[PDB]
């Protein structure tokens, strides 16, 4: 890399990252074609700015299309780039797409534990508790150990919704991982058991 | 503490027993005439008996140990059905695998055969 190439990349990436943060996917596309005109090859961090710009404007189809451009260009997406797509999929309740992207991260040899945690909290936050349980159990049964805060979140939200079957499944997996249930978790299950008519 | 003499090689005090242990003389010895006994211990299957006791020292509850071994044995049979039931028994395979997982070395499923069998058709006959 020469000094001239480094100087141009800095000013090209200054403009690109200032439009991704501006929530302007169209402008981030113009700079990439400016890079192509100058002969610079867009790397993983240039397509990250394109994914993020679409993702920030709640655009799942454009962000997925941007990822296809990155893979089609032969570039390797950054672990943060996949996390932006996974978190976006959860915000729209698209658990199938979120699980497809997690499979890609494993294929790319990344560490999917952090991205799996993010996917579950997004589904819970956006009132997709049924989808969140399906994703959480697949990760928990697959061997991943969730965070203590997410364990307390899943048990409590299921018991507030009258879903004892999911809350008992998770608490069994929580102890198998190595986190023993406390009075708080038992009080969540009891809140539903006390209304079943069988003391 | 740190000492280097002339040529830069560090010189240091090697630690030694500098004291008498009477247990050293009378304990690092050996009996010479147990070849027959050792060979019968392996023939009758007493080695696995000691291995089972070894595995149970690492277990809090012997009933969950029994259940876990049976669960692992069921998985072996579904995975490879035809290899078990004769000279290789699935429960014996599980136990030898668990001893090898500790880093020790045992033959697979504790299976051994008579090398002095005079050809096919001949059964070793037991002296009661």
């Amino acid at each position: 890399v020469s000094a001239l190439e480094r100087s141009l990349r800095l000013t090209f990436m200054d403009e690109l990252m200032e439009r991704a943060r501006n929530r302007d996917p169209s402008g981030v596309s113009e700079v990439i074609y400016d890079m192509i005109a100058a002969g610079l090859s867009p790397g993983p961090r240039s397509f990250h700015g394109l994914v993020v710009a679409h993702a920030l404007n709640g655009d799942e189809q454009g962000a997925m299309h941007s990822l296809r451009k990155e893979l089609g260009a032969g570039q390797r997406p950054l672990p943060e780039t996949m996390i932006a797509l996974v978190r976006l999929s959860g915000s729209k309740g698209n658990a199938q797409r979120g699980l497809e992207l997690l499979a890609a991260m494993e294929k790319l040899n990344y560490d999917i534990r952090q991205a799996w945690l993010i996917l579950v909290e997004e589904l819970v936050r956006t009132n997709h508790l049924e989808e969140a349980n399906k994703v959480f159990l697949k990760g928990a049964r697959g061997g991943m150990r969730a965070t203590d805060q997410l364990y307390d979140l899943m048990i409590e939200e299921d018991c507030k919704a009258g879903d004892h079957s999911n809350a008992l499944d998770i608490s069994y997996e929580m102890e198998a991982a190595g986190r023993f249930a406390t009075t708080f978790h038992f009080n969540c299950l009891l809140s539903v058991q006390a209304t079943c008519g069988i003391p | 503490g740190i000492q280097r003499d002339d040529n830069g090689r560090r010189i240091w005090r090697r630690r030694t027993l500098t004291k008498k242990d009477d247990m050293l003389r009378y304990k690092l010895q050996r009996v010479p005439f147990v070849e027959e006994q050792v060979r019968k211990i392996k023939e009758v299957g007493k080695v696995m008996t000691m291995d089972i006791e070894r595995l149970l020292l690492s277990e809090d509850n012997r009933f969950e140990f029994v259940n876990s071994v049976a669960a692992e044995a069921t998985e072996y049979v579904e995975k490879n059905r035809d290899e078990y039931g004769g000279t290789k028994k699935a429960i014996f395979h599980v136990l030898s695998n668990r001893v090898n997982d500790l880093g020790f070395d045992r033959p697979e499923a504790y299976a051994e055969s008579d090398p002095y069998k005079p050809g096919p058709g001949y059964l070793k006959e037991y002296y009661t």
Partner: peptide
Amino acid sequence: GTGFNKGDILFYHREFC
């Protein structure tokens, strides 16, 4: 005893080259 206590993205998205 033993009865106690119940006993594909990244495919078809490669570089054309």
